[PDB]
């Protein structure tokens, strides 16, 4: 038995109105901890907010779409609890309009595209992003973070930013988004579908 400890901590984020923001929080414990979200001390409620669990509730994503500037700019808190202990961490969300978009805010130059792949074969979804400074890229599948490292080598994220999936299972099917992040803010690609066979 151990108290919860965070394995993924949500970072402060700056997003673009009409866009998407995801906060990810994950913890480990024994017993397995439960993740919970609050915006300003209140349980979250909207047509424009979704919470998606993973890791059997030990992982959680808060997804806001479309971002709306006055409403969504706030501090969001993740809490992880088990019988032994409670821990929390917070992150700030900022939403910019067009009018306020700094030069070098990331751009998706060529987003990923619909792809259909044979069961055996390998698929790579493409994100080519721009910005100053060069954005880091991450991927979400069906609203959830794709973690290449957890894959026992099957899935890799290339330096181009594309995602390479090999030995494609049926579990690979899903809508993939690429997020480009830099000091200016975060931008999502449109979703792209991967079907198997």
UniProtKB/Swiss-Prot annotation:
Cysteines engaged in disulfide bonds, as pairs: 25-78, 127-178
Location relative to the cell: Membrane
Domain Ig-like C2-type, first and last residues per copy: 4-94, 106-195
Tissues showing expression: Expressed in the cell of the T lineage but not in cells of any other hemopoietic lineage.
Superkingdom assignment: Eukaryota
Sites where the protein binds heparin: 39-48
Glycosylation sites (chain numbering): 88
Family label: Belongs to the protein-tyrosine phosphatase family. Receptor class 2A subfamily.
Subunit comment: Interacts with GRIP1. Interacts with PPFIA1, PPFIA2 and PPFIA3. Interacts with PTPRF.
Function: Possible cell adhesion receptor. It possesses an intrinsic protein tyrosine phosphatase activity (PTPase) and dephosphorylates EPHA2 regulating its activity.
Domain-related comment: The first PTPase domain has enzymatic activity, while the second one seems to affect the substrate specificity of the first one.
Protein name in the entry: Receptor-type tyrosine-protein phosphatase F
The species this protein was found in: Mus musculus (Mouse)
Higher taxonomy: Eukaryota, Metazoa, Chordata, Craniata, Vertebrata
Gene name linked to the record: Ptprf
């Amino acid at each position: 038995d151990s108290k919860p400890v965070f394995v993924k901590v949500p970072e402060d984020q700056t997003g673009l109105s009409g866009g998407v923001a995801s906060f990810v929080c994950q913890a480990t414990g024994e017993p397995k901890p439960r993740i919970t979200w609050m915006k300003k001390g209140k349980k979250v409620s909207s047509q424009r907010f979704e919470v998606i669990e993973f890791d059997d509730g030990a992982g959680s994503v808060l997804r806001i779409q479309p971002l709306r500037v006055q409403r969504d700019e706030a501090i969001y808190e993740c809490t992880a609890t088990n019988s032994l202990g409670e821990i929390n961490t917070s992150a700030k969300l900022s939403v910019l309009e067009e009018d306020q978009l700094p030069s070098g805010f990331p751009t998706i130059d060529m987003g990923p595209q619909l792809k259909v792949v044979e069961k055996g074969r390998t698929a790579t979804m493409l994100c080519a992003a721009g910005g100053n400074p060069d954005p880091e890229i991450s991927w979400f599948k069906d609203f959830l973070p794709v973690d290449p490292a957890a894959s026992n080598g099957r899935i890799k994220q290339l330096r181009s930013g594309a995602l390479q999936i090999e030995s494609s299972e049926e579990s690979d099917q899903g809508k993939y988004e690429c997020v480009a992040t830099n000091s200016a803010g975060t931008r999502y690609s449109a979703p792209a579908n991967l079907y198997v066979r």
